Design a protein around this nucleic acid. Structure first.
Ligand code: ZN
Ligand code: ZN
Ligand code: ZN
Lengths: 397, 71, 131, 103, 808
RNA sequence: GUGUAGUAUCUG
RNA sequence: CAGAUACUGACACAGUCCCUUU
């Protein structure tokens, strides 16, 4: 007895979300990827509602999603790393109202294996290279370039293998017209499998390794690797080069740290704590997501905790050295897996469990009543939550 | 020799392999595969009232030395 | 001592926690409506005649090679992720036939000696009858 | 060549270079040495394509004239996800008849 | 030991192969002293035969990996007989030293070789000073290149004499030559080491430094400019004040750096060196006169030099000094010029360079004509003929026709040139077909068996264009003319005529051939009896082509003679003959019928030669596949109960090929073969189980994904007992069968079989089980997550995956 | 007709 | 340790010399 599999309703589970000019004009679209469905949707700036333009299926789980553009261009591309065991670069075609296959490179077997690149994906902000790395020992780097045919080109992959290494996160460091640099969180475990006493399992720190891409000798080597104090989960890139300093924003447990290569001090500002918490006072506090609103005039950052509280990270510097980090409670929203700070004062929040919201920004949070925190204050901060008073709800999915 | 391909891939055993290093690889592969499928993590995050980031962090932390210390 | 045989295998790719056989529309038939853990609702309706199963299998086999997945992965291998597929024909790939270029549509249709409207009409008719 | 258990394969990495095949072996599988249903192209690492080794046949090493291919069994079994199949060995059944026929 | 050694050195090849085994794995038992001091003096014997050298060096390849730490004391005495080995002009001789010294270094250390071989630098002999660079390079290929940099950094800095610096720079040059692109990661660390020799006060080390830097520049062709940043000045401010052979090295070094530059540096620095480049076009020497041409070609092959500028500058002097009647004396200059001329056409334009040599083929000398014709054909084949106008094409046609008419010796370039030109022109050659056809026919008629084959090859090449030129009448006339020449005694002429006939048959339709096929095949059949390889190789293809489409013009009676005659053609040597002889059976059975044809093939399984039974097996498989599988299966299965063994294995071998060929259609005949594999997988000879394993492998691979595992599960129960074998072939087939079954059934069933005896208390069983587990583990790694068993906890450990027991 | 690996059985 | 007789791997057959330089 044969069976025919039809469908009635498509999955609405959001896992990743990116924003950019995927069409070509001066309008920003959102590419939201479901579990195994690639979707495109844009909001109307005049009424606020959101429409659907494409619901193409990829027939396979997606483990990463990134967007980038070439230097001196006006179109945004999509890089997808998935269980397929390959790397795919897409392109949106408004005339055909469908995606366009461009490149396809094979670098291993298929399946969610251990040593298979595809989990962590990072791209150069300037748009000159891309790094796809596995959970262990299978770091791989490509070199993107443009030729006289005005078409994207892919060179041979460059291996950066390292045995007995676990990777927590990979981010691309912003450098102004220099060699590309990438950061990762390695942690060796070779010594932990040779001591039966088990003392080597503890007191084992993880390092912040920076990888140097030699654009003249065509090889990748690691330069800096320094141990850390406590474990972190994810990193936030800082716009550098000519607009702001260059570095990372490691978000460890109950702390946020800024570290830069070379000679530069470190800043550790404890995360603010809710006033009169009713929970057990032995549970750590960590971040779940972030955002970036880089602008030529001024830039800030966003974050969200386990309870769903949006903060506002602002860095302080004079020429290159970062002096202090100034946190400030922004609003309270349901816990989400990704955010997209849209232009024209629009914010998109994609909840991990429930409906999906879309808010607009009326005030940027200037000259407020609540105080702002900093790392200069000695010594367990507190704050009082309240209604929004800064955002309004205009659409719900 | 046909053992060239089997050697470059980690997790490959031989005639003198002890149970402990087989089970630690068995647990590590499962831990890695947990973060791959999205619904396999949704089930874990619904079973215990936690967030996806917390479950991912715990799974990453548990990979340093699963199945206890060796003998 | 007395094992049981398996007559069907598949891989939806999402966790399923609901299974029920109940007619969905007035005058319909017995379906196998299930619900996924992400928000998807699907059915596992069977074939009625015998001359339609061969056509559907041919269409699926031809689209397996004339329309590769966007990411790029063997559809047969994807549906055989844990256990090999058995007595199941994917319907999403068949319904995807409605979205290509006219030349490719004609090239796919010409092997079966049919017009693209003829293929589309029955593809919609089978869907509009059980649901 | 699976008939000679002396040859050693490369298995380094893939690339943007497509292998070539000569007149003596036009439609043969790289690994299976079969003759049915070519499926996928063949890529070679940059170490196997440089100067004097550019545009040479994968199996024997003569002047290539047509592109190489993988059979359908190699695609179903995913035997093409290993690296490059270029032979990096001179062999014993091809480098001995030289001295045997010199006399 | 001695008896084995002199049995190997002088004996029959089977006895030598048998006796070579006991000397391989018994090296350290005798020790590095006795066997080496007994085998080295024999190689020390002068005037040793060439066949002896390979045999005496092959033993090292088997006995080296047994004495890792025992090859230290007499490294110098070992390599005094190996350093001259890798300098011989023979291609295979150099490999036999390069692939043994590298392995010996891999089985040794730096401190021994360097210490023993350091005082070889200060030697007056040139041969040792030249072979020492290669000695460094072969050992630096392995053992890692960066580990030798600290030692090399002091070799070419000694103040004792220039010999150390010369040796070091030669070492660097050889390393760059035979390392390839592996020196790219640390090119900068190597440039500065030899950068100081460019301003030395001696005209003996500057040239070798230039050669070394040229080698490094050519090794990293597309990358590595920033490393060559501080060397521009020494090479650039050093050519005006240098003259002679030393300037050639500097020019060669500076030639490679031009492509590496950007669109600005190359463009700027080309002009200031073009002055010397132009001035150097005249010189009594030729070794330096080809380096200048190579530099010209390399400068042309850049993205910075424009077209109008280079056309105005380089062409007037380049096309006045080199186009002479003396460059043909040396083959190196000939090849360099013909290779260099192409890029000018590739960049500035085909016609602008073609028109300057079109009016040159009318010359008395033949070497000059051969030199110019291949350049013209290479230029024509790259770009095309879209830029050629009427006058230039007329002149080119006249010149090529005159050159083809005047032939002196056996040069295989006129055919290629004329064919390439005719193909490039295409349909613009219409007013020239009668003339070329008449000339070809006249050359074919009444010649001394040396240009008739040339004319046949020419018409075979040019038959394609005449179809687009609408000249089928002359094609039919040529086909009629070629018929009466099939009686030629010479084999080469007959083969060329057969190839021409095949080309004519291919280009034109089958129903419009002026000579009837019914009047051709009776004449064609006796031809398939010559022992010459060439005549059969191109007559079998013609017979197959005739049988393909021209099968309804021929009655079934005379096909029987061809069927019997094809059986003698399976005993040939080249595989191209048999690959088509097998396929012709399937071509003709579609028209005749798979009853009488298949009966003849079955009898052919009693020839007691291995190369013919396999071919008959493939013929049976293809004839079964082409017509229908079921109409011939019972006849094939009936021929299994005969007492003979070779025919018994023939049907088993044919089943595998048939199943591989049919593929998706094997799900209907899956039941018929099962009660033949069932009693094939018994305690019979090893050949039956070896072949049935491949049969099962192909059978399972062909039906994957269609849900036919019910019989595959039953068949799996017989392959597993035949795994504990020792012969390489049977295990090689059984593992392949298991791997082919694991993709059609699933890893869940194979894991249960494998886990039964993984931790067996024996070792031979454990090795096999672990090998099978590794084979299953490499493929479908993620699919094993849900099929793992449950293991309970011991005293102090966690062996239970508690995360999978969560309940919603 | 020859060469290049591998395997089985009887006898000394 | 050797001899003899059978067998397997669509094994290959002047293969040709393509930085060896003055
Ligand atoms: Zn070849
Ligand atoms: Zn294959
Ligand atoms: Zn390679």
């Amino acid at each position: 007895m044969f069976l025919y599999n039809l469908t009635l309703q498509r999955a609405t589970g959001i896992s990743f979300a990116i924003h950019g000019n995927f069409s070509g004009t001066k309008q920003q679209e959102i590419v939201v990827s479901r579990g195994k469905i690639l979707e495109l949707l844009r909001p109307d700036p005049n009424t606020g509602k959101v429409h659907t333009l494409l619901t193409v299926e990829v027939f396979g789980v997606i483990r990463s999603l990134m967007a980038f553009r070439l230097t001196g261009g006006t179109k945004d591309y999509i890089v997808v790393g998935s269980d397929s065991g390959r790397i795919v670069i897409l392109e949106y075609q408004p005339s055909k109202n469908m995606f366009e296959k461009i490149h396809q490179e094979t670098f291993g077997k298929s399946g969610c294996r251990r040593i298979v690149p595809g989990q962590f994906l990072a791209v150069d902000p300037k748009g000159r290279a891309v790094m796809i790395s596995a959970i262990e020992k299978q770091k791989l780097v490509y070199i993107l370039n443009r030729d006289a045919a005005a078409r994207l080109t892919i060179s041979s992959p460059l291996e950066a293998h390292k045995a007995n290494t676990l990777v927590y996160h990979v981010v691309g460091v912003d450098v102004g017209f220099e060699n590309p640099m990438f950061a990762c969180l390695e942690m060796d475990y070779e010594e932990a499998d040779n001591d039966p006493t088990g003392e080597a399992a503890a007191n084992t720190q993880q390092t912040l390794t920076f990888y140097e891409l030699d654009l003249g000798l065509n090889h990748v080597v690691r330069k800096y690797s320094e141990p850390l104090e406590e474990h972190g989960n994810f990193l936030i890139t800082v716009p550098g080069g000519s607009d702001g300093p260059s570095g990372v924003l490691i978000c460890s447990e109950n702390y946020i740290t800024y570290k830069n290569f070379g000679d530069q001090p470190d800043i550790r500002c404890p995360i603010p704590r809710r006033r009169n918490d009713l929970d057990d006072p032995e549970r750590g506090m960590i971040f779940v997501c972030s955002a970036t609103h880089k602008t030529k005039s001024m830039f800030f950052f966003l974050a969200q905790t386990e309870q769903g509280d949006i903060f506002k990270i602002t860095l302080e510097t004079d020429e290159d050295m970062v002096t202090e980090i100034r946190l400030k409670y922004f609003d309270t929203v349901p816990v989400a897996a990704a955010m997209c700070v849209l232009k024209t004062g629009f914010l998109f929040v994609a909840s991990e469990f429930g409906n999906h919201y879309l808010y607009q920004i009326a005030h940027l949070g200037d000259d407020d009543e609540e105080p702002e925190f900093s790392s200069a204050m000695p010594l367990t901060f507190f704050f009082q939550p309240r209604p929004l008073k800064n955002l309004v709800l205009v659409d719900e999915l | 020799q046909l053992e060239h391909l089997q050697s470059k891939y980690i997790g490959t055993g031989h005639a003198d392999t002890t149970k402990w290093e087989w089970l630690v690889n068995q647990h590590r592969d499962s831990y890695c595969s947990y973060m791959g499928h999205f619904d396999l993590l949704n089930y874990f995050a619904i079973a215990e009232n936690e967030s996806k980031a917390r479950v991912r962090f715990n799974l990453m932390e548990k990979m340093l030395q699963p199945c206890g210390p060796p003998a | 001592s007395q094992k049981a045989e398996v007559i069907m295998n598949y891989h939806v790719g999402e966790t399923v926690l609901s299974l029920q056989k109940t007619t969905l529309i007035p005058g319909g038939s017995e379906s196998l409506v299930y619900t996924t853990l992400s928000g998807g609702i699907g059915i596992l309706v069977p074939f009625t005649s015998h001359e339609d199963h061969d056509f559907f299998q041919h269409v699926e086999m031809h689209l397996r090679s004339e329309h590769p997945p966007l990411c790029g992965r063997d559809h047969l291998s994807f549906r055989s992720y844990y256990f090999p597929v058995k007595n199941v024909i994917d319907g999403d790939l068949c319904e995807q036939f409605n979205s290509m270029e006219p030349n490719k549509q004609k090239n796919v249709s010409e092997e079966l000696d049919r017009t693209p409207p003829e293929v589309s009409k029955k593809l919609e008719d089978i869907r509009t009858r059980y649901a | 060549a699976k008939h000679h258990p002396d040859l050693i394969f490369c298995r380094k990495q893939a690339g943007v270079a497509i292998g070539r095949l000569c007149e003596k072996c036009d439609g043969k599988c790289v690994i299976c040495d079969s003759y049915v249903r070519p499926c996928t192209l063949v890529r070679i690492c940059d170490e196997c394509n440089y100067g004097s080794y550019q545009g040479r046949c994968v199996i024997c090493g003569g002047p290539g004239v047509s592109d190489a291919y993988y059979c359908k069994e190699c695609t179903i079994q995913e035997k093409d996800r290993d690296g490059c199949p270029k032979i990096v060995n001179l062999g014993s059944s091809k480098t001995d008849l030289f001295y045997e026929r010199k006399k | 030991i001695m008896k084995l050694l002199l049995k190997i050195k002088n004996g029959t090849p089977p006895m030598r192969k048998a006796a070579l085994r006991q000397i391989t794995d018994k090296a350290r038992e005798f020790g590095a002293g006795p066997l080496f001091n007994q085998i080295l003096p024999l190689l020390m014997s002068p005037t040793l035969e060439d066949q002896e050298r390979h045999l005496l060096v092959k033993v090292i390849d088997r006995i080296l990996y047994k004495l890792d730490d025992l090859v230290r004391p007499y490294v110098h005495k070992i390599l005094v007989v190996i350093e001259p080995l890798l300098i011989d002009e023979d291609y295979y001789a150099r490999v036999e030293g390069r692939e043994i010294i590298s392995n010996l270094a891999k089985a040794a250390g730096l401190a021994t070789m360097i210490s023993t071989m350091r005082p070889d630098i200060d030697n007056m002999d040139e041969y040792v000073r030249n072979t020492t660079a290669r000695a460094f390079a072969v050992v630096a290929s392995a053992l890692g290149i960066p580990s030798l940099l600290p030692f090399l950094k002091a070799v070419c800095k000694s103040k004792k004499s220039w010999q150390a610096r010369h040796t070091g720079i030669k070492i660097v040059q050889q390393i760059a030559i035979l390392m390839g692109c592996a020196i790219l990661p640390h090119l900068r660390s190597l440039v500065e080491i030899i950068e100081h020799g460019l301003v030395d006060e001696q005209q003996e080390v500057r040239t070798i430094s230039a050669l070394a830097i040229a080698a490094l520049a050519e090794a990293a062709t597309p990358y590595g400019i920033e490393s060559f940043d501080s060397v521009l000045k020494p090479l650039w401010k050093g050519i005006r004040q240098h003259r002679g052979k030393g300037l050639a090295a500097f020019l060669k070094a500076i030639g490679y750096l031009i492509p590496l530059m950007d669109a600005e540096y190359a463009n700027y620095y080309t002009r200031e060196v073009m002055l010397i480049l132009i001035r150097e076009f005249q010189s009594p020497d030729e070794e330096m006169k080809k380096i200048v041409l190579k530099v010209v070609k390399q400068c042309c092959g850049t993205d910075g030099v424009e077209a109008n500028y280079i056309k105005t500058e380089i062409l007037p002097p380049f096309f006045k000094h080199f186009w002479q009647h003396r460059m043909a004396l040396d083959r190196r200059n000939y090849r360099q010029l013909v290779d260099t001329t192409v890029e000018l056409a590739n960049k500035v334009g085909a016609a602008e360079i073609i028109s300057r040599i079109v009016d040159d083929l009318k010359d008395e000398a033949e070497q000059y004509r051969k030199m110019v014709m291949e350049t013209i054909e290479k230029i024509m084949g790259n770009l095309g003929a879209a830029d050629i106008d009427h006058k230039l094409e007329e002149q080119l046609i006249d010149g090529i026709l005159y050159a083809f008419q005047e032939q002196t010796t056996e040069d295989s370039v006129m055919l290629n040139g004329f064919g390439t030109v005719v193909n490039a022109l295409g349909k613009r050659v219409k007013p020239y077909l009668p003339q070329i056809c008449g000339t070809v026919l006249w050359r074919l008629n009444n010649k001394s068996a040396k240009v008739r084959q040339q004319a046949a090859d020419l018409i075979s090449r040019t038959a394609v264009v005449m179809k687009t030129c609408q000249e089928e009448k002359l094609m039919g006339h040529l086909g009629v003319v070629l018929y009466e020449y099939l009686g030629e005694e010479y084999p080469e002429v007959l083969g060329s005529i057969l190839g021409a006939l095949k080309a004519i048959v291919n280009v034109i339709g089958m129903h419009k051939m002026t000579p009837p096929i019914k009047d051709l095949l009776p004449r064609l059949t006796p031809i398939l009896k010559n022992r010459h390889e060439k005549v059969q190789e191109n007559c079998i293809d013609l017979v197959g082509r005739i049988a393909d489409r021209g099968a309804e013009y021929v009655s079934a009676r005379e096909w029987m003679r061809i069927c019997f005659e094809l059986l003698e053609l399976l005993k040939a040597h080249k595989k191209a003959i048999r690959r088509a002889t097998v396929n012709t059976f399937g071509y003709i059975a579609k028209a005749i019928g798979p009853h009488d044809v298949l009966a003849t093939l079955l009898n052919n399984l009693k020839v007691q030669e291995r190369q013919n039974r396999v071919c008959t097996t493939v013929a049976i498989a293809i004839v079964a596949e082409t017509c229908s599988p079921f109409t011939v299966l019972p006849a094939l299965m009936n021929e299994y109960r005969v007492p003979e063994l070779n025919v018994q294995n023939g049907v088993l071998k044919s089943l595998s090929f048939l199943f591989e060929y049919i593929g998706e259609m094997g799900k209907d005949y899956i039941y018929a073969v099962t009660p033949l594999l069932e009693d094939a997988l018994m305690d019979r000879d090893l050949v039956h189980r070896q072949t049935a394993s491949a049969v099962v492998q192909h059978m399972s691979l062909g039906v994957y994904g269609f849900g036919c595992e019910d019989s595959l599960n039953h068949l799996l129960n017989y392959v597993w007992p035949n795994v504990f074998e020792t012969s390489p072939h049977v295990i090689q087939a059984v593992m392949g069968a298991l791997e082919g079954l694991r993709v059609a059934i699933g890893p869940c069933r194979m894991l249960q079989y494998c886990l039964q005896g993984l931790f067996h208390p024996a070792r031979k069983v454990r090795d096999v089980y672990w090998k099978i587990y590794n084979s299953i583990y490499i493929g479908s790694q993620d699919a094993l997550i849900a099929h793992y068993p449950r293991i309970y906890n011991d005293d102090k450990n966690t062996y239970i995956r508690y995360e999978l027991d969560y309940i919603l």
